[PDB]
């Protein structure tokens, strides 16, 4: 169950808010976008851009994966983010995410035809 794609889309998307709204953005959106379900996702970004332009980083700069993959994309301008990471505080399943809004570069991998992000790589 779930595509590449639409897992991608479930746990980096957010054109809905410009910015992360309040500290307890991150709290909110691991609930529902269901990484809290059988785990605490330790760490998790959100995109605040529309899909499209999330889905051009796969058309701009060829960049290498953490891992060494050869299919990662570099975002050529920056993008509004919001990076959820798990707190000290956090004990499952009562997660705790610290929020920290950002401006920057995202790095995605991409895979398909349609060619499309298929996972959130770093940003910068």
């Known amino acids: 169950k779930e ?4 897992k991608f ?3 980096h998307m957010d054109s809905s808010t410009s910015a992360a709204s309040s ?20 760490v ?21 994966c953490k891992n060494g993959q050869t299919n990662c994309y570099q975002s050529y301008s920056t ?21 920290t809004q950002a401006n920057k570069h995202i790095i995605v991998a991409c895979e398909g035809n349609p060619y499309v992000p298929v996972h959130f790589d770093a940003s910068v």
């Open 23 to 42: 500290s307890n953005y991150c709290n909110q959106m691991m609930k529902s976008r269901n990484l809290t379900k059988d785990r605490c996702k330790p």
């Open 3 to 6: 595509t590449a794609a639409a």
């Open 9 to 11: 889309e479930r746990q």
């Open 79 to 99: 993008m509004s983010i919001t990076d959820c990471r798990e707190t000290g505080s956090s004990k499952y399943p009562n997660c705790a995410y610290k929020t």
């Open 44 to 64: 998790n970004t959100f995109v605040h851009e529309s899909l499209a332009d999330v889905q051009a980083v796969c058309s701009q700069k060829n960049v290498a």
